């Protein structure tokens, strides 16, 4: 039933290493039979029960133990058990593979598509055979079986490189060592550290460690060296990968008959085209271009009174090893922004507490933490989701937000159950797990304020996943464009940024007494600090992965350095490959991470134009904002659903505004 | 798959 708990939750995090790879098999005997089904069928005997139904329930049935089988390589604590999800991970992508190019599949989808009332089946239905056909012409089914062969191969060997590019720098355990002079100005940090022979601590390149070094430490040559270990990482054996990857992607994309593997991969999203990204990154970076001159020539000031002040050396630039640091400090003297103060006003049970009830309060959801919870480790928690007008059970998250040996290093958002239909007829409960790393409670845990952007942003996709409800799985949860799947967490960052929401979110740990509404003014007024370097790195970023996809006869990590030059003026440290590094490459965001920056316009868009305008916490824009915009999931294109919420179609006005500009 |  759909007003009911029992029983909906199918998953389990019991697994042992041989469990899964005979449940591997299993469900691809299960599976692959379907299809055999479907294939073995005669093109005449084709209909909508015996096709479409069919392959349409075995997605579901698929997805749902795809996820107990390829979810523990990124939280479980045993390390077998993570090879084995691992491995099952690579020979499902291998299985998926085999079945998206089957031939007698898309002939039958093709047939059935050209006979079929299709104004007598729904218009999700329809959708399912549109995406289906252009799945089959994208995965080159109308090409010669030769030619289907050789993209086979590749793609399977694309998809191992993929899993083992971001594996390397999940498993990597690189670290430097260093006194306690050299990490000077660092805050007592120092103690929660391990020490080695000669009174030396031992400083990991992840992002606990990373960024409180760069953001904080006085001693330039420990930032450097930290620097360079860190765009380093992997860097022989990922360069080795994007040596291959690259061209693949280039000779698979010509083989299906696109210039480009941006131009392939930009069909499937709200941009269309390489030349709106190309016009609206160029565009964007050339608005920035003032603020990024006024903050660099600030800085470079601020740099020669600290290098006159404490005696050192000062080279006259703006190294990548100064650019956090000196970027802390303006936000120090420009707003009095004490990060290390202002966190302790953030304990991860008040932050916790408060996103929970702005989120209940604004979408119309009842929250219950569920007691004695099936778990993968004891630390992390279970929620059901209800309707609180209907009282109709949504779904169910998890939140698993200490880090520890084995998970993953950073934050993200996983689908484990779509909210879509069954053969049964009934609802599927969506399942969804907030993945993130903040300390750990003898001191509670304490969060700086991007953090709970961080955990913000997260749950937006957590909502998306929850809330949407579609028929066929292909199209629940956030299974949106890529360029707009950032939608729904970038706009929830927004409630980060209002005085109110913060003073219901902060909590100092020992007084229990609020922040002062001085620090709560300047925090706001904060927005706009570093905005131009912050987002002009965003545009290297964004253009390099562009760059990266267009043509691949360019050395990787001197395009981006190219970038960092022209558009950031931030140079690329000589020997590094930051590319190496660049897990999104890799993860599903290849030629397609302007998405971020081209998201932000239409979270920004709806923000200003509808919440900021009657009040950010209306439950009757926020049901519209959940109806319109997360409900409907991949069942919609992105741009329609922007435009049953505003209205119209979006703009940059809002955005623009965001950052200062015009 | 993952979002981040
Ligand atoms: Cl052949
Ligand atoms: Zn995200």
């Known amino acids: ?662 | 798959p993952r979002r981040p």
């Open chain 1, 1 to 662: 039933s759909s007003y009911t708990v029992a029983g909906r939750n199918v998953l389990r995090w019991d697994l042992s290493p041989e469990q899964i790879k005979t449940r591997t098999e299993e469900l691809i005997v299960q599976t692959k039979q379907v299809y055999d089904a479907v294939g073995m069928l005669g093109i005449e005997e084709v209909t909508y029960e015996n096709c479409l139904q069919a392959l349409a329930d075995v997605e579901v049935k698929y997805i749902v133990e795809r996820t107990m089988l390829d979810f523990p390589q990124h939280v479980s604590s045993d390390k077998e058990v993570r090879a084995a999800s691992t491995e099952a991970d690579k020979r499902l992508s291998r299985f998926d593979i085999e079945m998206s190019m089957r031939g007698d599949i898309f002939e039958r989808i093709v047939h059935l598509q050209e006979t079929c009332d299709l104004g007598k089946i729904k218009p999700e239905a329809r959708r399912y055979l549109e995406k289906s056909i252009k799945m089959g012409k994208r995965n080159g089914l109308h090409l010669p079986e030769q030619v289907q062969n050789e993209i086979k191969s590749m793609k399977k060997r694309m998809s191992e490189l993929c899993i083992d590019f971001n594996k390397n720098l999940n498993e990597d355990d690189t670290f430097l060592v260093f006194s306690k002079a050299e990490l000077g100005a660092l805050p007592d940090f120092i103690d929660s550290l391990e020490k080695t022979d000669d009174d030396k601590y031992k400083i990991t390149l992840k992002y606990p460690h990373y960024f409180p070094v760069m953001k904080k430490c006085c001693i330039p040559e420990t930032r450097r060296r930290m620097e360079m270990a860190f765009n380093t990482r992997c860097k022989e054996e990922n360069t080795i990968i994007l040596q291959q990857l690259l061209p693949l992607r280039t000779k698979v994309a010509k083989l299906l008959g696109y210039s480009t593997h941006a131009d392939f991969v930009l069909e499937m999203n709200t941009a269309k085209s390489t030349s709106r990204v190309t016009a609206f990154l160029d565009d964007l970076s050339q608005k920035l271009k003032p603020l990024g001159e006024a903050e660099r020539e600030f800085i470079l000031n601020l740099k020669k009174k600290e290098c006159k002040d404490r005696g050192f050396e000062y080279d006259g630039k703006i190294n990548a090893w100064d650019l956090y640091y000196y970027m802390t400090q303006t936000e120090e003297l420009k707003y009095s922004i004490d990060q290390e103060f202002l966190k302790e006003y953030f304990p991860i049970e008040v932050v916790t507490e408060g996103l929970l009830n702005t989120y209940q309060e604004l979408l119309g959801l009842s929250f219950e933490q569920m007691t004695d919870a099936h778990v993968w480790n004891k630390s992390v928690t279970l929620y059901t989701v209800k309707d609180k007008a209907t009282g109709e059970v949504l779904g169910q998250f998890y939140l698993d937000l200490y880090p520890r040996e084995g998970k993953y290093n950073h934050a993200a958002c996983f689908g484990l159950q779509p909210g879509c239909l069954l053969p049964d007829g009934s609802r599927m409960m969506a399942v969804a797990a907030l993945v993130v790393n903040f300390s750990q409670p003898g001191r509670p845990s304490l969060l700086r304020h991007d953090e709970v952007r961080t955990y913000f942003h997260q749950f937006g996709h957590v909502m998306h996943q929850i809330c949407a409800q579609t028929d066929f799985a292909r199209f629940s949860g956030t299974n949106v464009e890529t360029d707009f799947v950032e939608v729904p967490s970038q706009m929830l960052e927004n409630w980060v940024w209002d005085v109110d929401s913060l003073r219901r979110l902060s909590k100092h740990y020992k007084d229990g007494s609020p922040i002062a509404d001085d620090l709560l003014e300047k925090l706001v007024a904060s927005r706009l600090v570093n905005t131009g370097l912050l987002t002009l790195r965003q545009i290297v970023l964004s253009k390099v992965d562009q760059s990266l996809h267009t043509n691949t006869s360019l050395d990787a990590a001197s395009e981006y350095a190219k970038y960092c030059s022209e558009i950031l003026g931030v140079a690329a440290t000589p020997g590094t490959n930051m590319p190496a590094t660049f897990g999104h490459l890799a993860g599903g965001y290849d030629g397609q991470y302007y998405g971020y920056l081209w998201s932000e316009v239409f979270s920004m868009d709806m923000f200003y134009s509808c919440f900021k305008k009657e009040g950010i916490m209306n439950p009757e824009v926020g049901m519209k904002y959940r109806n319109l915009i997360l409900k409907p999931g991949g069942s919609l294109d992105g741009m329609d659903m922007l435009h049953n919420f505003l209205k119209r179609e979006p703009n940059q006005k809002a955005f623009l505004m965001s950052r200062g500009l015009h």
